[PDB]
């Protein structure tokens, strides 16, 4: 509930694999947010995406709502987010840029899978922190 | 995917296990017997005195490769290690002849010999439990016959060809009794050891000891121990007509058949298939066929050099892997 | 050797990746490279001598499978664990850099993986190339670490 | 010189097949490929072991110094 | 074939030299 | 009592276990890979991997990092025992198939 930083439904326009066999760069425009655009690299053998399909895209922190320092998966029966999402990535917002007055772009790297999210009014929701989950469901 | 190795036109995909807890949120596939016990299967396609073909189904690549590696380079076998030349007047050098004798495989059962201790002086190191002595005394003479002039050198000279069968077993000590029912002979008697002319002589004896293929190839007991993943051919959409014949000609002769009546091509025997991915270059079956390999289905082909049966070789490989695991578990861990 | 990684004629690095090292780095960091936990840990053990502690980061892909990218592998190459002090920040163009789809779009949005972004020893974009792991470049990973 | 005992790559014994290969070629002549296949030399390494062997020991034995 | 030799024959050669 | 076969590498070892490097002599990819697979099938193990530091040395460093449940030594012991049980299963199946045919 309070851990989702961004949430929108996107209509995919283009899915081009550029010299790739499992990663595509999808282009999607928002629904009812005419200014919000989305460019996203997706593993399409885990989450296949076709041109003109509806994607519910959510950005959240704290997906699950020791000093071992190595990431440990949550328990199998854990009531967490991503139960209702088909594709989840973990990355970091490393760049905020202005594309025009009242319009900014946010850049995420999910281990090299890049996402560029564009919009206007998200200033109290999107930050430059490691905690950023991308949740996509068809 | 999902246990199937992907055979594409330019690359191979999905080649790793992905069967451990931590692959996904469902921390399944954690180790336990009584799951491996019920899953694992062995299917012996054929068994011979020297070649075994068997399937290890639902086992991991690492374990199967461990068995293959142990068979190639860790199952002991008996080979000549030292050759003592009393006389060699042939055109083949002594080192070359010794190497050839060492490469000759001997039909002597391992576990009937004891490992030589290297820490012993050469005059007490070789015992009757450690060593097999093979003698070789061949002399060439002109044949006392009158055949056609300059014929082949078989009726022209006597003992012109030295064969592995000319290696004579020389029992030492108690070997006169233990080896009485199973005299040591080369596994391939007709190996051409040497060719030599009248007046030339080879007189030697060779000491044959247990050894490891990792140390020297002559000790390897398999002429090749190997496996292959079971091929998988998926006909996604029906292929019929002359297209079916074209599709069928892209595989080895008996791989996929043509149905009579329904007229559609069908996969008749994917085990016969060598994965040349010849179908993947034709653009008319690009959307009609998917080539794969079952990742946990191993078709083992073990062919013995001759000393032991291939089933014994494989069982010894499994025993060796288990024994090294056991010995490591029993070893105390040093700081 | 450690005191002479740069040529004195220009200051550019001269001890760096050769051909197969560059090709292997490029193949690891290729955008199609995804590794499960077992493969990743074996890669890190081969990367070290099986005697280096690695802090395994969260995987790039968490659903349906826990998959790490090769860029995370090379991030762990740069900074194996928290006790390592090597925090590297780097912007570099790979030798084969096709520009992004639009003039105004930033450089890491290249149509290929032609622009390397490293922020906090974490490789965020771009393949591991000759231009970022080889000789003659002052935006090199090893040059920056030096 | 003389046929190697074993295939370099496989370790399969090929030194017991040289003479049978020669007699397959001479008596009731066969093609080289079918002669190799009839001897069990299936893999191409073991095939080249016999196919590419130059029997130089016969030429060397013409200069036998102990006649 | 199809007859066990590992059961009936004690494996001496498998001992560590 | 072989005190040279397996050695805990103290420099590459965490406080209170859960991370360790073991040096095993006279072993190579054969045991290393099978042991690594079996250990990785342990839910407590978060990092298993071996390396042969140099081909000129009959040596093998295997790395185990766990969570807080068990130690790296216990993970290694469990992996070795599970490898033995796997080998027993394979031996039994192969023997029964050979006898039946
Ligand atoms: Zn061969």
XYZ file of N, CA and C in Angstrom, chain B residues 163-319:
471
model
N 53.919 -59.324 -33.262
C 52.581 -58.983 -32.811
C 52.527 -58.954 -31.291
N 51.486 -58.298 -30.773
C 51.299 -58.230 -29.329
C 51.118 -59.615 -28.726
N 50.603 -60.567 -29.506
C 50.440 -61.929 -29.016
C 51.775 -62.612 -28.755
N 52.869 -62.103 -29.326
C 54.186 -62.646 -29.027
C 54.678 -62.257 -27.640
N 53.977 -61.364 -26.947
C 54.289 -61.077 -25.552
C 53.853 -62.254 -24.689
N 54.818 -62.919 -24.063
C 54.563 -64.125 -23.288
C 54.480 -63.789 -21.807
N 53.418 -64.260 -21.159
C 53.268 -64.086 -19.722
C 54.270 -64.967 -18.987
N 55.010 -64.369 -18.054
C 56.026 -65.064 -17.265
C 55.621 -64.996 -15.799
N 54.874 -65.982 -15.304
C 54.446 -65.951 -13.899
C 55.638 -65.966 -12.954
N 55.527 -65.196 -11.877
C 56.578 -65.083 -10.876
C 56.006 -65.418 -9.506
N 56.658 -66.340 -8.806
C 56.217 -66.693 -7.466
C 54.839 -67.322 -7.477
N 53.946 -66.784 -6.643
C 52.601 -67.328 -6.508
C 51.723 -67.051 -7.719
N 52.184 -66.231 -8.667
C 51.423 -66.006 -9.889
C 51.257 -67.281 -10.703
N 52.118 -68.278 -10.482
C 51.959 -69.561 -11.157
C 50.638 -70.223 -10.790
N 50.102 -69.914 -9.610
C 48.845 -70.479 -9.136
C 47.670 -69.524 -9.309
N 47.827 -68.265 -8.889
C 46.717 -67.318 -8.931
C 46.278 -67.028 -10.361
N 47.227 -66.966 -11.293
C 46.937 -66.687 -12.693
C 46.820 -67.951 -13.533
N 46.798 -69.127 -12.900
C 46.764 -70.377 -13.653
C 45.491 -70.496 -14.482
N 44.354 -70.080 -13.924
C 43.090 -70.192 -14.637
C 42.849 -69.043 -15.606
N 43.642 -67.975 -15.529
C 43.473 -66.790 -16.370
C 44.839 -66.258 -16.781
N 45.522 -66.939 -17.701
C 46.836 -66.457 -18.143
C 46.730 -65.093 -18.809
N 47.735 -64.256 -18.570
C 47.712 -62.880 -19.053
C 48.044 -62.865 -20.540
N 47.141 -62.302 -21.334
C 47.358 -62.115 -22.767
C 46.992 -60.678 -23.109
N 47.546 -60.139 -24.193
C 47.074 -58.837 -24.673
C 45.611 -58.910 -25.078
N 44.878 -57.830 -24.801
C 43.474 -57.780 -25.189
C 43.316 -57.764 -26.703
N 44.302 -57.225 -27.420
C 44.324 -57.207 -28.882
C 45.596 -57.912 -29.331
N 45.536 -59.221 -29.582
C 46.763 -59.960 -29.923
C 47.392 -59.543 -31.241
N 46.617 -58.985 -32.169
C 47.095 -58.719 -33.518
C 47.625 -57.302 -33.697
N 47.890 -56.584 -32.604
C 48.551 -55.290 -32.719
C 49.925 -55.493 -33.334
N 50.222 -54.729 -34.382
C 51.515 -54.821 -35.052
C 52.539 -54.067 -34.216
N 53.295 -54.802 -33.401
C 54.304 -54.168 -32.562
C 55.503 -53.717 -33.384
N 56.020 -54.596 -34.239
C 57.220 -54.284 -34.996
C 57.243 -55.089 -36.285
N 57.970 -54.559 -37.260
C 58.322 -55.268 -38.479
C 59.837 -55.299 -38.582
N 60.380 -56.448 -38.967
C 61.825 -56.612 -38.958
C 62.252 -57.691 -39.944
N 63.501 -57.585 -40.367
C 64.096 -58.295 -41.485
C 65.049 -59.379 -40.998
N 65.462 -60.297 -41.879
C 66.371 -61.368 -41.450
C 67.644 -60.824 -40.823
N 68.062 -61.465 -39.737
C 69.191 -61.007 -38.963
C 68.846 -60.046 -37.849
N 67.614 -59.552 -37.797
C 67.176 -58.654 -36.739
C 66.440 -59.441 -35.663
N 66.570 -58.983 -34.422
C 66.059 -59.700 -33.267
C 65.574 -58.706 -32.225
N 64.457 -59.030 -31.583
C 63.973 -58.294 -30.422
C 63.879 -59.272 -29.263
N 64.568 -58.958 -28.171
C 64.509 -59.746 -26.946
C 64.337 -58.786 -25.782
N 63.198 -58.875 -25.104
C 62.894 -57.963 -24.015
C 61.977 -58.656 -23.023
N 61.836 -58.035 -21.855
C 60.719 -58.320 -20.972
C 60.210 -57.012 -20.387
N 58.913 -56.978 -20.100
C 58.242 -55.774 -19.641
C 57.556 -56.032 -18.310
N 57.680 -55.073 -17.399
C 57.013 -55.124 -16.107
C 55.726 -54.315 -16.192
N 54.599 -54.970 -15.936
C 53.280 -54.371 -16.086
C 52.672 -54.168 -14.706
N 52.277 -52.931 -14.409
C 51.806 -52.553 -13.085
C 50.489 -51.799 -13.211
N 49.786 -51.703 -12.087
C 48.589 -50.880 -12.013
C 48.943 -49.410 -12.203
N 48.021 -48.672 -12.805
C 48.252 -47.258 -13.029
C 46.962 -46.560 -13.389
N 47.064 -45.244 -13.526
C 45.913 -44.359 -13.635
C 45.989 -43.602 -14.954
N 44.857 -43.537 -15.662
C 44.820 -42.846 -16.941
C 45.216 -41.387 -16.851
N 44.930 -40.742 -15.720
C 45.413 -39.390 -15.506
C 46.925 -39.298 -15.493
N 47.597 -40.329 -14.982
C 49.054 -40.375 -15.009
C 49.567 -40.591 -16.430
N 49.175 -41.699 -17.056
C 49.509 -41.964 -18.447
C 48.310 -42.590 -19.142
N 48.123 -42.235 -20.415
C 46.977 -42.727 -21.174
C 46.968 -44.244 -21.278
N 48.146 -44.872 -21.281
C 48.224 -46.322 -21.403
C 47.453 -47.031 -20.302
N 47.273 -46.382 -19.156
C 46.527 -46.950 -18.049
C 45.027 -46.722 -18.164
N 44.584 -45.887 -19.093
C 43.158 -45.650 -19.251
C 42.480 -46.925 -19.737
N 41.392 -47.355 -19.101
C 40.759 -48.627 -19.456
C 39.653 -48.533 -20.494
N 39.325 -47.340 -20.974
C 38.243 -47.146 -21.928
C 38.829 -46.578 -23.212
N 38.508 -47.212 -24.341
C 38.900 -46.642 -25.622
C 38.116 -45.370 -25.911
N 36.913 -45.252 -25.351
C 36.293 -43.954 -25.096
C 35.113 -44.173 -24.165
N 35.110 -43.486 -23.030
C 33.932 -43.387 -22.183
C 33.338 -42.000 -22.366
N 32.071 -41.948 -22.755
C 31.438 -40.680 -23.079
C 29.936 -40.828 -22.908
N 29.252 -39.690 -22.901
C 27.801 -39.669 -22.907
C 27.336 -38.639 -23.921
N 26.028 -38.617 -24.144
C 25.405 -37.566 -24.928
C 24.001 -37.357 -24.391
N 23.570 -36.101 -24.360
C 22.208 -35.798 -23.950
C 21.227 -36.326 -24.985
N 20.139 -36.911 -24.510
C 19.159 -37.503 -25.411
C 18.527 -36.415 -26.266
N 18.600 -36.506 -27.591
C 18.013 -35.461 -28.435
C 16.499 -35.429 -28.317
N 15.937 -34.252 -28.576
C 14.495 -34.047 -28.557
C 14.107 -33.234 -29.780
N 13.207 -33.780 -30.591
C 12.698 -33.106 -31.779
C 11.205 -32.898 -31.590
N 10.774 -31.642 -31.623
C 9.372 -31.280 -31.457
C 8.854 -30.750 -32.787
N 7.915 -31.476 -33.385
C 7.238 -31.030 -34.595
C 6.054 -30.183 -34.138
N 6.216 -28.861 -34.206
C 5.212 -27.955 -33.657
C 3.933 -27.986 -34.481
N 4.064 -27.922 -35.802
C 2.936 -27.979 -36.709
C 3.127 -29.120 -37.698
N 2.040 -29.704 -38.200
C 2.175 -30.835 -39.122
C 2.951 -30.463 -40.377
N 3.834 -31.367 -40.792
C 4.586 -31.243 -42.036
C 4.187 -32.416 -42.919
N 3.676 -32.118 -44.111
C 3.147 -33.133 -45.008
C 3.590 -32.842 -46.435
N 3.352 -33.814 -47.313
C 3.680 -33.660 -48.715
C 5.166 -33.809 -48.988
N 5.598 -33.187 -50.088
C 7.019 -33.170 -50.418
C 7.817 -32.421 -49.359
N 7.173 -31.487 -48.655
C 7.825 -30.827 -47.531
C 8.180 -31.824 -46.441
N 7.334 -32.835 -46.227
C 7.650 -33.868 -45.245
C 8.883 -34.661 -45.651
N 9.009 -34.995 -46.938
C 10.199 -35.705 -47.400
C 11.449 -34.840 -47.266
N 11.344 -33.553 -47.610
C 12.477 -32.650 -47.431
C 12.876 -32.559 -45.965
N 11.886 -32.443 -45.077
C 12.143 -32.397 -43.642
C 12.795 -33.685 -43.161
N 12.360 -34.822 -43.701
C 12.892 -36.110 -43.282
C 14.323 -36.308 -43.759
N 14.683 -35.710 -44.893
C 16.048 -35.849 -45.388
C 17.059 -35.017 -44.605
N 16.614 -34.153 -43.694
C 17.523 -33.346 -42.890
C 17.982 -34.044 -41.617
N 17.539 -35.269 -41.377
C 17.921 -36.049 -40.213
C 18.528 -37.373 -40.661
N 19.291 -38.040 -39.795
C 19.789 -39.391 -40.109
C 18.651 -40.301 -40.543
N 18.947 -41.371 -41.295
C 17.882 -42.039 -42.078
C 16.657 -42.473 -41.285
N 16.832 -43.008 -40.081
C 15.698 -43.550 -39.353
C 15.159 -42.679 -38.239
N 15.496 -41.391 -38.247
C 15.154 -40.532 -37.119
C 13.659 -40.245 -37.078
N 13.107 -39.669 -38.142
C 11.698 -39.302 -38.164
C 11.064 -39.963 -39.380
N 9.845 -40.473 -39.209
C 9.160 -41.187 -40.262
C 8.011 -40.393 -40.863
N 7.461 -40.940 -41.943
C 6.314 -40.362 -42.632
C 5.126 -41.282 -42.396
N 4.082 -40.752 -41.765
C 2.889 -41.549 -41.515
C 2.200 -41.900 -42.827
N 1.715 -43.133 -42.921
C 0.893 -43.530 -44.052
C -0.563 -43.191 -43.768
N -1.238 -42.622 -44.762
C -2.563 -42.096 -44.509
C -2.498 -40.634 -44.123
N -2.413 -40.380 -42.812
C -2.327 -39.016 -42.297
C -1.230 -38.213 -42.992
N -0.177 -38.891 -43.463
C 0.787 -38.368 -44.433
C 1.740 -37.390 -43.742
N 1.454 -37.058 -42.487
C 2.302 -36.158 -41.724
C 3.598 -36.832 -41.298
N 4.669 -36.046 -41.292
C 5.923 -36.500 -40.717
C 5.796 -36.576 -39.202
N 6.529 -37.513 -38.608
C 6.508 -37.696 -37.165
C 7.877 -38.182 -36.720
N 8.203 -37.910 -35.460
C 9.496 -38.295 -34.906
C 9.450 -39.784 -34.576
N 10.230 -40.577 -35.308
C 10.240 -42.025 -35.145
C 11.280 -42.489 -34.131
N 12.474 -41.890 -34.145
C 13.520 -42.261 -33.192
C 14.468 -41.069 -33.054
N 14.311 -40.312 -31.967
C 15.210 -39.197 -31.699
C 16.531 -39.648 -31.094
N 16.604 -40.887 -30.605
C 17.864 -41.411 -30.091
C 18.875 -41.617 -31.210
N 18.400 -41.956 -32.411
C 19.262 -42.099 -33.576
C 19.778 -40.767 -34.098
N 19.260 -39.650 -33.598
C 19.542 -38.349 -34.186
C 20.870 -37.807 -33.676
N 21.781 -37.522 -34.600
C 22.907 -36.645 -34.328
C 22.437 -35.217 -34.561
N 22.747 -34.324 -33.627
C 22.194 -32.980 -33.707
C 23.069 -32.138 -34.622
N 22.846 -32.268 -35.925
C 23.490 -31.431 -36.924
C 22.719 -30.148 -37.180
N 21.538 -30.011 -36.574
C 20.595 -28.914 -36.814
C 20.570 -28.510 -38.286
N 20.422 -29.522 -39.144
C 20.321 -29.286 -40.578
C 18.960 -28.717 -40.958
N 17.927 -28.975 -40.151
C 16.619 -28.377 -40.396
C 16.620 -26.877 -40.147
N 17.539 -26.376 -39.329
C 17.508 -24.988 -38.892
C 18.111 -24.026 -39.909
N 18.376 -24.481 -41.130
C 18.926 -23.637 -42.180
C 18.006 -23.505 -43.385
N 16.708 -23.769 -43.238
C 15.842 -23.916 -44.398
C 14.650 -22.972 -44.425
N 14.313 -22.329 -43.306
C 13.388 -21.199 -43.293
C 11.958 -21.618 -43.638
N 11.764 -22.876 -44.035
C 10.421 -23.403 -44.230
C 9.981 -24.321 -43.101
N 10.919 -24.786 -42.275
C 10.614 -25.454 -41.018
C 11.028 -24.612 -39.817
N 11.299 -23.321 -40.030
C 11.740 -22.463 -38.935
C 10.680 -22.371 -37.845
N 9.412 -22.269 -38.237
C 8.303 -22.217 -37.297
C 7.617 -23.565 -37.125
N 8.191 -24.637 -37.674
C 7.558 -25.947 -37.656
C 8.307 -26.983 -36.832
N 9.524 -26.691 -36.383
C 10.322 -27.652 -35.632
C 11.087 -26.920 -34.539
N 11.214 -27.570 -33.386
C 12.044 -27.091 -32.288
C 13.016 -28.199 -31.917
N 14.307 -27.904 -31.989
C 15.343 -28.867 -31.646
C 15.763 -28.674 -30.198
N 15.953 -29.786 -29.493
C 16.314 -29.724 -28.093
C 17.166 -30.906 -27.689
N 17.575 -30.884 -26.424
C 18.309 -31.974 -25.803
C 17.858 -32.073 -24.357
N 17.485 -33.276 -23.929
C 17.085 -33.466 -22.539
C 18.327 -33.342 -21.667
N 18.307 -32.384 -20.738
C 19.530 -32.030 -20.027
C 19.907 -33.062 -18.973
N 18.928 -33.752 -18.387
C 19.197 -34.732 -17.342
C 19.059 -36.168 -17.837
N 19.054 -36.378 -19.151
C 18.989 -37.713 -19.738
C 20.299 -37.965 -20.473
N 21.116 -38.864 -19.934
C 22.462 -39.114 -20.432
C 22.521 -40.501 -21.052
N 22.945 -40.569 -22.309
C 23.128 -41.832 -23.012
C 24.617 -42.154 -22.956
N 25.005 -42.976 -21.987
C 26.403 -43.336 -21.800
C 26.802 -44.437 -22.772
N 27.948 -44.265 -23.424
C 28.551 -45.304 -24.251
C 29.956 -45.556 -23.725
N 30.150 -46.703 -23.083
C 31.430 -47.084 -22.500
C 31.977 -48.254 -23.301
N 33.124 -48.050 -23.943
C 33.818 -49.114 -24.650
C 35.148 -49.387 -23.963
N 35.353 -50.639 -23.573
C 36.541 -51.037 -22.839
C 37.732 -51.203 -23.771
N 38.912 -50.838 -23.268
C 40.142 -51.180 -23.967
C 40.354 -52.687 -24.030
N 39.780 -53.437 -23.091
C 39.825 -54.885 -23.132
C 40.046 -55.543 -21.786
N 40.579 -54.790 -20.820
C 40.991 -55.391 -19.554
C 39.796 -55.771 -18.685
N 38.800 -54.894 -18.575
C 37.608 -55.189 -17.793
C 36.359 -54.936 -18.619
N 35.248 -55.478 -18.134
C 33.969 -55.263 -18.789
C 33.508 -53.821 -18.581
N 32.826 -53.230 -19.566
C 32.391 -51.831 -19.421
C 31.459 -51.598 -18.243
N 30.603 -52.569 -17.914
C 29.768 -52.431 -16.727
C 30.620 -52.349 -15.467
N 31.678 -53.163 -15.390
C 32.591 -53.076 -14.257
C 33.306 -51.734 -14.230
N 33.683 -51.210 -15.398
C 34.350 -49.908 -15.446
C 33.439 -48.823 -14.879
N 32.175 -48.812 -15.311
C 31.242 -47.806 -14.811
C 30.984 -47.971 -13.317
N 30.802 -49.212 -12.859
C 30.571 -49.432 -11.437
C 31.772 -48.981 -10.620
N 32.980 -49.224 -11.129
C 34.181 -48.761 -10.447
C 34.243 -47.242 -10.411
N 33.780 -46.577 -11.470
C 33.763 -45.116 -11.448
C 32.818 -44.586 -10.374
N 31.623 -45.173 -10.272
C 30.696 -44.760 -9.219
C 31.297 -45.043 -7.845
N 31.937 -46.205 -7.697
C 32.589 -46.554 -6.440
C 33.691 -45.567 -6.091
